[PDB]
Symmetry: D2
Subunit: 170 residues, 4 copies
Amino acid sequence: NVTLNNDKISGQAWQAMRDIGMSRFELFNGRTQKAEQLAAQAEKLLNDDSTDWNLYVKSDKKAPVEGDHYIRINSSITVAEDYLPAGQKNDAINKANQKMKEGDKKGTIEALKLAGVSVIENQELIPLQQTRKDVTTALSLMNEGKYYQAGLLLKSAQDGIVVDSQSVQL
Amino acid sequence: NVTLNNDKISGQAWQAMRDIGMSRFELFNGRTQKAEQLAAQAEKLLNDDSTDWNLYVKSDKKAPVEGDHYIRINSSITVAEDYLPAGQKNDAINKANQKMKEGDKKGTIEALKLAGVSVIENQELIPLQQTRKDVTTALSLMNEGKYYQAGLLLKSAQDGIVVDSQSVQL
Amino acid sequence: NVTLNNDKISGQAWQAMRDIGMSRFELFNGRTQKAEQLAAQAEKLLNDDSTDWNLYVKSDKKAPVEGDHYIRINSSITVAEDYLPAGQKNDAINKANQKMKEGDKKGTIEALKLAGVSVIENQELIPLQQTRKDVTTALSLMNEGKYYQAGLLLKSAQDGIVVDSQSVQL
Amino acid sequence: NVTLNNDKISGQAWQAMRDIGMSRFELFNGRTQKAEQLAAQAEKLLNDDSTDWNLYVKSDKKAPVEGDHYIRINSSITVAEDYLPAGQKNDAINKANQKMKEGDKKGTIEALKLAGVSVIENQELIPLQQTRKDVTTALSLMNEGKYYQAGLLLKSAQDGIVVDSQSVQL
Ligand SMILES: [Cl-]
Ligand SMILES: [Cl-]
Ligand SMILES: [Cl-]
Ligand SMILES: [Cl-]
Ligand SMILES: [Cl-]
Ligand SMILES: [Cl-]
Ligand SMILES: [Cl-]
Ligand SMILES: [Cl-]
Ligand SMILES: [Cl-]
Ligand SMILES: [Cl-]
Ligand SMILES: [Cl-]
Ligand SMILES: [Cl-]
Ligand SMILES: [Cl-]
Ligand SMILES: [Cl-]
Ligand SMILES: [Cl-]
Ligand SMILES: [Cl-]
Ligand code: NA
Ligand code: NA
Ligand code: NA
Ligand code: NA
């Protein structure tokens, strides 16, 4: 999948983060072997050598750990609707719908502005190498029987998700 | 998957909510046919006649719409750690790790209490019929070309996700 | 302030949680004496002997720590809007506005239902004694110079905030 | 208050956003005159002519509406803790505590890195003029008796809050 500006989003890393959360839950749920399976899947997803990880990097954002980079894992939309009289907004929304039908992203943004609607794109990001290290280290702790400590690292990986909300500039 | 109390969680409905969010994004991304495909997948997941939806119902929670019910779609954990001197907490955490290894949920909760750690389970819920109606109606609006209005219903479905955070009573 | 069902909400505890967050930030901001001042204010707010803390208790919710109770610190609204043709919804919303003008909460909920709008009340809660202990212990750690450890307890207090989202049953 | 880089944060705008949320709740709570009072307070806070609003602007972030700017209303911290053996981390945390005592922000960040801890600063931002317009227009709608529509604009103002999470570069 791609952002509004056509930059690639990592579905593998999104699924890895989902697996990380499920893994942590299974530690507390008394299913530590299931937790290891889920963390192992996350490790394979984040370290896939056939994936070109450069494609997902948000270059304009400094990661906390030296040499690391944030990658895009999801995009969503926030709209902000100004008050308009019912009639004027219907006609403006109808034109916005035509641009979406046409695949015209810029025309959609501009028609929505005439409807009093601003658009913000929320890009969910993770630091790639820091997340990889959390997963691999958590698995090592699980191998050692240090399950609570593994859970702390899985939670830290989740807490490293950030959301860059930006106005749409196509 | 199951909660700490062994109640079933709907992976299909979780994926349906993921599909609903992606569908809404694709409307703004100028890919309305992709949005319809994603909403159609969500509709099939939420309306699977081979699924016994009773298994996922949280019976002790009144849904906003008459006749409806909330279903469980995810569980996560929140811990709250009291301050303990480094030595006393290590020994208590080590015993908690043994109970997790043993699959002993109650023993895990009790050992964590000795470590100064309380456990809260966060159950993500959706109203099943209200969400079904949002998806089916959004698809109908997409068929009619009313894409912005479909996006509003998809967002409403997402805003209907609630999180019941409860202390663990096994 | 009060919930939709006229149960009291603690403005003091809300401000205490705000102070707890600011206190934690000031630790990292190199202003540990400011952090102590903010945590001391939170302690005074949560332990005010002139406040009748029973007024804010959500009795139908078991707190994680034995003998403790959750108290209400905020209420907000989530609406869920069904799709209605523009004309029918305007007339229904106009009637909802009259009930709000009249102070008629039940009539507002019922008029909104005719407009295709369901209402959910989100009650933010904290465990009172567990939060008190976090604050007092964090101050003690600050007195000892253990600032990072104090920050962990302040964060734990914040992570103990839960949101009970319930359909409106007046 | 100030960020880690000593940029000013608007306490007035933070309180305005708090007032906006309370105002919206009071509409549904059948207290429309209280909602107007709270929105009027938010309007006065955001439009204070004695405040130098330039002090709070995050210049490196484009606001959705032409001519507008994002302003800082809060800062918080996220830590990410690597796994370290208990002994090595205690000694590293003890040195971090000394730098916080000394007010040495850069030394704190560097000592925390030796403890395996990365620091992210989360800056809560609002678009100033777009938020002002939401509040003033919502009050006008309240004067007209269009309470539900006012609530939509108050919610839109809240949905315009974004969080810029950045690694600490002092
Ligand atoms: Cl297992
Ligand atoms: Cl890379
Ligand atoms: Cl580093
Ligand atoms: Cl290890
Ligand atoms: Cl398409
Ligand atoms: Cl059912
Ligand atoms: Cl109903
Ligand atoms: Cl329809
Ligand atoms: Cl200070
Ligand atoms: Cl009490
Ligand atoms: Cl207890
Ligand atoms: Cl102590
Ligand atoms: Cl009033
Ligand atoms: Cl300005
Ligand atoms: Cl504009
Ligand atoms: Cl107006
Ligand atoms: Na979206
Ligand atoms: Na979890
Ligand atoms: Na509200
Ligand atoms: Na903070």
